Homo-oligomer: A and B are copies of this chain.
């Protein structure tokens, strides 16, 4: 019941007491571990509110105080009367930050307390949502000096008035399937690109076309909006030693901004809560550029370096992968766009992890996601045993809107 994690590089052991407060399920059982699986009413509501308020009021050193009791009382009344309740600004900010804090798959959580929170709960329309999102993008981008932020739109009511952002990220490149059989642009974004076109987007059918926003307010039909181009910061990709790299035509956007998750706080559900931080280098160089089901550019890069691609044992893929990733970090750094390499980030997480164990009694973490997709064992997290478990407030996955939406 009091669990221990070992670092096999430093022999350091930590004791986890925090997991006892876990509520949601993992997917795993005593008979089977699903650690590598990507996706495993009023009576319901008040205990949820109370659990949340109890930790809010405990966090502000006023547990069991009049203001505490009063709030509980007050929220209990409002749930009884309204079948829901509204979070106070203070609670909203706490909840959002703690959702990030609890995100067991996120390596960048050392930053958790510095989340800029934008209360968009007064928003009523998609144009409204658009205005709020452009403001988010511009604030967070900050001319390349990125700042973490989240914008929170009205909470769910009866599930038929949901606010949803249909894009998976605020900024992503379109994907087009060619009559020639291949795929132009980002293959991960093909299906969404079709919905855009089906909703009226006129695609430029280029390779790096910034997608339009599909915004949905109050459970209404989603609307299309183009982000002001001058608000979308992009970085041309060059290599510091290889002159020819620039001719590969590669660029990436500076702002990673997840927009399809569900934020849960005290039983309330925020279905539209786009948040953003800044890139770890490998997300772009390893995953986005080198995944077979993405831009898949390894072969072309390798050819340009003139490597022996005859046998896998020349490790030409590995060589090219390093250089591709060198170029990304180099390109961003040269243009003063905030980026972090996988070494620096993982080292930060180990410090954060220790901090959490020391001050909170633990830190839920998913090793499968925390370990970077390249050079894993030369990063400290690889040798770090982690306990994975679900704490609330949380960001959750939710079904894509098109399967849900009654047009």
The residues of A with any CB-CB pair to B shorter than 8 Å are 3, 5-6, 8-10, 19, 22, 25-38, 281, 286-287, 290-293, 298, 312-315, 317-319, 321-322, 325-326, 329, 333, 341, 343-344, 366-368, 371-378, 382-389
Q: Give the docked Cα–Cα distance between A376 and B287 (Å).
A: 10
A281 to chain B, nearest CB (A): 7
Q: Give the docked Cα–Cα distance between A19 and B5 (Å).
A: 27
A327 to chain B, nearest CB (A): 10
The residues of B that contact A376 with a CB separation of less than 8 Å are 371-374, 376
Residue of B nearest to A33 (CB): B388
A237 to chain B, nearest CB (A): 15
The residues of B that contact A291 with a CB separation of less than 8 Å are 9, 377, 383
Q: Give the docked Cα–Cα distance between A382 and B344 (Å).
A: 22
CB < 8 Å neighbour of A378 from B19, B286, B384, B389: B286
The residues of B that contact A31 with a CB separation of less than 8 Å are 19, 22, 25-26, 389
- Contact across chains for A377 and B286 when beta carbons are under 8 A apart: yes
Q: Give the docked Cα–Cα distance between A382 and B135 (Å).
A: 37
- Contact across chains for B30 and A28 when beta carbons are under 8 A apart: yes
Q: Give the docked Cα–Cα distance between A359 and B8 (Å).
A: 37
A320 to chain B, nearest CB (A): 9
A407 to chain B, nearest CB (A): 27
A357 to chain B, nearest CB (A): 15
Please name 10 further chain A to chain B contacts, defined as beta carbons within 8 Å, in addition to the given A22-B31, A36-B384, A313-B329, sorted by A numbering. Answer: A8-B293, A27-B33, A28-B35, A31-B389, A33-B33, A37-B387, A287-B377, A315-B326, A318-B374, A319-B326
The residues of B that contact A373 with a CB separation of less than 8 Å are 376-378, 382
The residues of B that contact A319 with a CB separation of less than 8 Å are 322, 326
A144 to chain B, nearest CB (A): 16
CB < 8 Å neighbour of A293 from B9, B321, B325, B333: B9
The residues of B that contact A384 with a CB separation of less than 8 Å are 36
- Contact across chains for A315 and B329 when beta carbons are under 8 A apart: yes
Residue of B nearest to A375 (CB): B318
Q: Give the docked Cα–Cα distance between A383 and B290 (Å).
A: 13
A27 to chain B, nearest CB (A): 8
The residues of B that contact A28 with a CB separation of less than 8 Å are 26, 28-30, 32-33, 35
The 5 closest A-B pairs by CB, nearest first: A35-B35, A373-B377, A36-B367, A28-B28, A312-B343
A39 to chain B, nearest CB (A): 9
The residues of B that contact A38 with a CB separation of less than 8 Å are 6, 8, 385
Most B-side CB within 10 Å, residue of A26, A368, A371, A377: A377
The residues of B that contact A325 with a CB separation of less than 8 Å are 315, 318
Residue of B nearest to A322 (CB): B318
9 contacts between A and B (CB under 8 A): A10-B293, A22-B32, A28-B28, A32-B388, A34-B387, A36-B384, A281-B313, A374-B378, A376-B376
- Contact across chains for B9 and A290 when beta carbons are under 8 A apart: no
- Contact across chains for B36 and A386 when beta carbons are under 8 A apart: yes
The residues of B that contact A374 with a CB separation of less than 8 Å are 318, 374-378
The residues of B that contact A382 with a CB separation of less than 8 Å are 373
- Contact across chains for B19 and A26 when beta carbons are under 8 A apart: no
Q: Give the docked Cα–Cα distance between A281 and B318 (Å).
A: 13
Q: Give the docked Cα–Cα distance between A382 and B291 (Å).
A: 10
The residues of B that contact A375 with a CB separation of less than 8 Å are 317-318, 321, 374-375
